[PDB]
Design a protein around this ligand. Structure first.
Ligand SMILES: CC(C)CCC[C@@H](C)[C@H]1CC[C@H]2[C@@H]3CC=C4C[C@@H](OC(=O)CCC(=O)O)CC[C@]4(C)[C@H]3CC[C@]12C
Ligand SMILES: CC(C)CCC[C@@H](C)[C@H]1CC[C@H]2[C@@H]3CC=C4C[C@@H](OC(=O)CCC(=O)O)CC[C@]4(C)[C@H]3CC[C@]12C
Ligand SMILES: CC(C)CCC[C@@H](C)[C@H]1CC[C@H]2[C@@H]3CC=C4C[C@@H](OC(=O)CCC(=O)O)CC[C@]4(C)[C@H]3CC[C@]12C
Ligand SMILES: CC(C)CCC[C@@H](C)[C@H]1CC[C@H]2[C@@H]3CC=C4C[C@@H](OC(=O)CCC(=O)O)CC[C@]4(C)[C@H]3CC[C@]12C
Ligand SMILES: CC(C)CCC[C@@H](C)[C@H]1CC[C@H]2[C@@H]3CC=C4C[C@@H](OC(=O)CCC(=O)O)CC[C@]4(C)[C@H]3CC[C@]12C
Ligand SMILES: CC(C)CCC[C@@H](C)[C@H]1CC[C@H]2[C@@H]3CC=C4C[C@@H](OC(=O)CCC(=O)O)CC[C@]4(C)[C@H]3CC[C@]12C
Ligand SMILES: CC(C)CCC[C@@H](C)[C@H]1CC[C@H]2[C@@H]3CC=C4C[C@@H](OC(=O)CCC(=O)O)CC[C@]4(C)[C@H]3CC[C@]12C
Ligand SMILES: CC(C)CCC[C@@H](C)[C@H]1CC[C@H]2[C@@H]3CC=C4C[C@@H](OC(=O)CCC(=O)O)CC[C@]4(C)[C@H]3CC[C@]12C
Ligand SMILES: CC(C)CCC[C@@H](C)[C@H]1CC[C@H]2[C@@H]3CC=C4C[C@@H](OC(=O)CCC(=O)O)CC[C@]4(C)[C@H]3CC[C@]12C
Ligand SMILES: CC(C)CCC[C@@H](C)[C@H]1CC[C@H]2[C@@H]3CC=C4C[C@@H](OC(=O)CCC(=O)O)CC[C@]4(C)[C@H]3CC[C@]12C
Lengths: 141, 110, 385, 140, 71
């Protein structure tokens, strides 16, 4: 009902569509990194629904500033102090930080800034349209 | 470009060898300016010269043509004229009224 | 000569700042002071005014020994061979813009005269603001500088439309009436940004960049394989002997190809860049790996690079435009990259001196090495320039 | 094939070049900070490829919100309930200062500059991508 | 396509060519630059012809005054 909050709300409803296209592209990149990381770091796994959860779990939170630094390159295949023997390294475990670097670069630097550009360059038309639509829907209210 | 044209040919480490020649040359040529020009011959200097006069005439002439093609000036120079025909056609109107009166009186006499 | 002196010594017409310029250069030459109210201004005095306004290593025809001889021997030999140049310089100095534009039409060397008038009008605009004169004089002199600069850009447009090759010869030929200078150099000294950024000047600078080499296909890679593989030099198409000889002061085909390749500015730049990358890769190695009491082989190459670079920057100070040593130092420090170069070389000097002592000064020497390696990646942006 | 996803994909392909120039400048700044941090904090090291890994490891994840707060300025050179924290390497206080400068330059300057170059080249890239997609409908 | 549809396609094409060319000519002839230029040239000719009319009218008025004097 408010003159400033109402157009703001329908403006958020307009940027739903650009968010959905960002979510589709981000889903592809996220899902590729999650499948690659889970399949490299866990070779001997039984069929279970926890694999599908592990595809989406930590790559989704890597967008929001939580990179899980203890699990990026865990130390393995050596003895670290009582003397403790760490489990041996799975083959190709060095690939996971590299594709992590590529994934984090693509998502946080490319796609979020691209969505900033899409939100920004379609702001003025959406703002004028939403203001006029709110002034039209005053009657219905 | 002019910095790298002036730099010795050898790189910093091997620039020691280059600086050696430079001072050896100083201690030799003395014991015995900046820019890349073209040093034209007097015949091509004239050809370059008349090229510059074709360009300077074509620039000024063009500026004048684009000034007169200016809608703004096609309107100014129309107004001046319009006024000079406006006073002249009014003089035509007064003179032809006198001509018709003289012709009517001439017909009445005849 | 006598008629032109009467033109310079007139009292009619609009006001001007020429009397302040003559007063300043007589104070600089003979430190006197204020001129007498009846000082006939000679053309020798005008030539010294042109010196302070042009700047650099300029040398006007008035102050040369040929003109000073005649002047003493007389106060068609006294007639000027190119009189509209003298009327241009005269009409610029006492701020007669409408007469200066008329004299730019008639005569010749219009591209030289417009760039000279642009550098002159900017220089007295700065001089009038420096001596706290009327600010309307400094605004109108800046406006006259922008008009003459715009005339040189639009004349450069017209030459490039008519003939591309004759426009380059217009831009580079020696200007004997303007201290043997160049139309390309006069735009740079006038700081005229629109002139150099024009497309005709840019292809001229590209031709200067390649040197005596045709090439112009897949740039960079062909000269890198030329540097690394010397027998790859001979398999590239060189430029003809009299195609465009930009020269400084005017088995055998194989040796001529080698000398023409290694003197090109693009080849000297890529040899400088590959030396800098190899130096920086060595200077990573000596700070990552531990170091002993004495420097290793890789550290001695690094120290040699800092010393030869410091000698090179010292030579750039000596081989510069001014005469006084303090003036040479000052003009070299207007560039910010030269200031940070001297600071970083001094830090490498004190860091290496501390490193060559024993502990705990060796650890202090390494810390200064690590702060220095922050700088040399930042200077790698100059290569990216 | 979709009328909105296709132009979006070739638009991403167009901004890859601006991303690559950001990657080059960020690589220069990241390597300078990583080499300085590794060479200060580890004075006695043998030649090993782990040094090259430690150049790139932590400074790369500083960009994405992980500053590794336990290793910014570790407590060192004093006893603390009782163990002896190891003695302090010379110049170890420089590492948080160049960390501060690097984090400022990276996260505040370079990401926002890439936002600016994405924003101001968006309209031309969008129109060109729409027209190129409408051209490539025939090939599809 | 068949020959008769080829004929209709060609005729339609000639119609479209004539439409585009002479609407281009109408757009050129109705612009402000062309209208103002044509008005300028026509006013030049009008002023020259009216000056000639002024001279001839002055001569004819003098001749009519002389003819009235003769009567
Ligand atoms: C607590 C967790 C689960 C977060 C909840 C997230 C969503 C369930 C909410 C958050 C913001 C909401 C949106 C905020 C604004 C709008 C605009 C509004 O729509 C209109 O005003 C209609 C006109 C238009 O769409 O422009 C209501 C739907 C929508 C999309 C909302 C749909 C539901 C959203 C996405
Ligand atoms: C591309 C972007 C914009 C969206 C894609 C991410 C989501 C589809 C993912 C990210 C986090 C995921 C959730 C992370 C954890 C869980 C808990 C999980 O429940 C359990 O594991 C049971 C309890 C337990 O075992 O501890 C069920 C799936 C769910 C909700 C996941 C559902 C799918 C989610 C929402
Ligand atoms: C292009 C994109 C959208 C494709 C995404 C594919 C995956 C997210 C899906 C496709 C097939 C799915 C699998 C299909 C079958 C199974 C078996 C299933 O096993 C059980 O539920 C246990 C069976 C039992 O003991 O009864 C566990 C999930 C899993 C591995 C699924 C995990 C998720 C997978 C890999
Ligand atoms: C396409 C965009 C616009 C929306 C995103 C949709 C999907 C990416 C989401 C929606 C429903 C989600 C599923 C909902 C429930 C589950 C069961 C969940 O199972 C468990 O967590 C089992 C318990 C365990 O072992 O931990 C695994 C994730 C999964 C397949 C989710 C995977 C991600 C899905 C397919
Ligand atoms: C043209 C540009 C792009 C590169 C030119 C420089 C490289 C060819 C140099 C710079 C750094 C050098 C490396 C620096 C340090 C070493 C360690 C060095 O080993 C030792 O000093 C210990 C063993 C021994 O004494 O041989 C062997 C050479 C090597 C790999 C060097 C090999 C040659 C490199 C790569
Ligand atoms: C012009 C500069 C900036 C770059 C030149 C690049 C290469 C020609 C240099 C850079 C690194 C140099 C290497 C650095 C270290 C060594 C180890 C060095 O080994 C010893 O001296 C071992 C015996 C001893 O201890 O005396 C032999 C030379 C070598 C291979 C050097 C050979 C020449 C290299 C490859
Ligand atoms: C699992 C981790 C390693 C993430 C994977 C990262 C990259 C392998 C992907 C992510 C986004 C992809 C890009 C997304 C969009 C495009 C545009 C598209 O190119 C075109 O449509 C051609 C026209 C054009 O480039 O404009 C396909 C290549 C490219 C650059 C893709 C190349 C591969 C990229 C960089
Ligand atoms: C400037 C930006 C845009 C890009 C620069 C960053 C990357 C080039 C760096 C950052 C993280 C780095 C990775 C971090 C960790 C590793 C694991 C490493 O493998 C091991 O250490 C073996 C396993 C182990 O010892 O635990 C191999 C290099 C790699 C992939 C590194 C390769 C180079 C990466 C991708
Ligand atoms: C402008 C930028 C891109 C320069 C970046 C340079 C560094 C990332 C490189 C250049 C030289 C490299 C060094 C060259 C040689 C070696 C020796 C090498 O030693 C061994 O492999 C052990 C020898 C053995 O036991 O066989 C370990 C890597 C290291 C220190 C390298 C680490 C990475 C360095 C410092
Ligand atoms: C220039 C832009 C566009 C792309 C970025 C390229 C480089 C920054 C990358 C590409 C290949 C990378 C290298 C690939 C492999 C390795 C081996 C890796 O070795 C280990 O991790 C050894 C195991 C250990 O002891 O931990 C160290 C990083 C390094 C030199 C990487 C350093 C970063 C490099 C040079």
């Amino acid at each position: 009902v408010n003159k400033y909050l109402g157009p703001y709300v329908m403006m958020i409803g307009k940027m739903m569509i650009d968010m959905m296209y960002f979510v589709i592209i981000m889903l592809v990149v996220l899902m590729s990194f999650g499948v690659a990381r889970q399949a490299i770091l866990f070779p001997n796994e039984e069929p279970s629904w926890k694999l599908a959860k592990n595809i989406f779990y930590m790559p989704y939170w890597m967008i929001y500033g939580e990179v899980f630094a203890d699990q990026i390159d865990p130390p393995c295949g050596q003895n670290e102090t009582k003397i403790i023997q760490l489990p041996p390294c799975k083959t190709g475990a060095w690939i996971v930080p590299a594709i992590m670097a590529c994934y984090l670069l693509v998502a946080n630097i490319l796609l979020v800034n691209l969505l900033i550009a899409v939100f920004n360059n379609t702001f003025f038309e959406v703002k004028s349209i939403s203001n006029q639509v709110w002034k039209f829907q005053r009657y219905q209210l | 470009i002019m910095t790298f044209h002036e730099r010795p040919v050898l790189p910093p480490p091997l620039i020691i060898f280059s600086h050696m020649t430079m001072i050896f040359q100083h201690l030799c040529c003395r014991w015995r300016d900046y820019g890349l020009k073209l040093f034209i011959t007097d015949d091509e200097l004239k050809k370059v010269h008349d090229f510059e006069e074709q360009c300077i005439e074509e620039y000024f002439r063009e500026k004048d043509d684009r000034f007169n093609s200016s809608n703004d000036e096609r309107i100014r120079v129309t107004s001046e004229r319009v006024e000079n025909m406006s006073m002249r056609l009014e003089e035509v109107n007064e003179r032809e009224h006198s001509m018709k009166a003289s012709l009517q009186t001439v017909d009445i006499r005849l | 000569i006598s008629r032109l002196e009467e033109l310079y010594n007139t009292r009619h017409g609009p006001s001007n700042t020429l009397y302040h310029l003559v007063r300043d250069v007589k104070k600089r030459e003979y430190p006197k002071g204020n001129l007498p109210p009846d000082y006939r201004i000679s053309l020798i005095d005008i030539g010294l005014v042109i010196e302070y306004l042009m700047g650099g290593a300029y040398r006007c025809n008035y102050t040369r020994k040929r003109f000073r001889t005649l002047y003493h021997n007389l106060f068609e030999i006294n007639h000027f061979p190119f009189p509209f140049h003298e009327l241009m310089v005269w009409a610029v100095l006492m701020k007669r813009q409408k007469m200066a534009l008329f004299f730019w039409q008639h005569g010749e060397e219009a591209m030289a005269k417009a760039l000279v008038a642009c550098k002159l009008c900017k220089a007295m605009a700065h001089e009038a603001s420096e001596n706290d004169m009327v600010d309307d004089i400094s605004q109108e002199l800046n406006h006259n500088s922008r008009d003459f600069g715009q005339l040189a850009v639009e004349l450069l447009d017209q030459s490039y439309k008519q003939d591309e090759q004759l426009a380059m010869k217009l831009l580079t030929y020696e200007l004997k009436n303007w201290s043997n200078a160049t139309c390309l150099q006069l735009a740079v000294a006038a700081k005229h940004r629109d002139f150099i950024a024009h497309t005709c000047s840019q292809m001229l600078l590209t031709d200067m960049w390649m040197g005596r080499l045709r090439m112009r296909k897949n740039s960079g890679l062909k000269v890198i394989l030329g540097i690394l593989l010397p027998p790859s030099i001979l398999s590239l198409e060189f430029k003809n002997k009299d195609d465009m000889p930009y020269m400084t002061q005017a088995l055998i085909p194989l040796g001529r190809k080698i000398y023409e390749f290694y003197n090109a500015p693009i080849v000297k730049f890529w040899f400088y860049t590959l030396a800098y990358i190899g130096y920086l890769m060595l200077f990573n190695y000596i700070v990552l790996v531990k170091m002993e009491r004495w420097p290793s082989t890789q550290e001695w190459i690094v120290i040699s690079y800092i010393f030869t670079l410091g000698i090179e920057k010292m030579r750039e100070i000596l081989m510069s435009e001014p005469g006084k040593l303090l003036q040479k130092v000052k003009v070299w420090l207007q560039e910010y990259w030269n200031v940070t170069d001297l600071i970083a070389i001094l830090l490498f000097s004190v860091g290496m001196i501390l490193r060559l002592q024993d502990q705990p000064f060796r650890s202090d020497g390494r810390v200064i090495y690590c702060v220095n390696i922050i700088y040399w990646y930042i200077r790698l942006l100059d290569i990216f320039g």
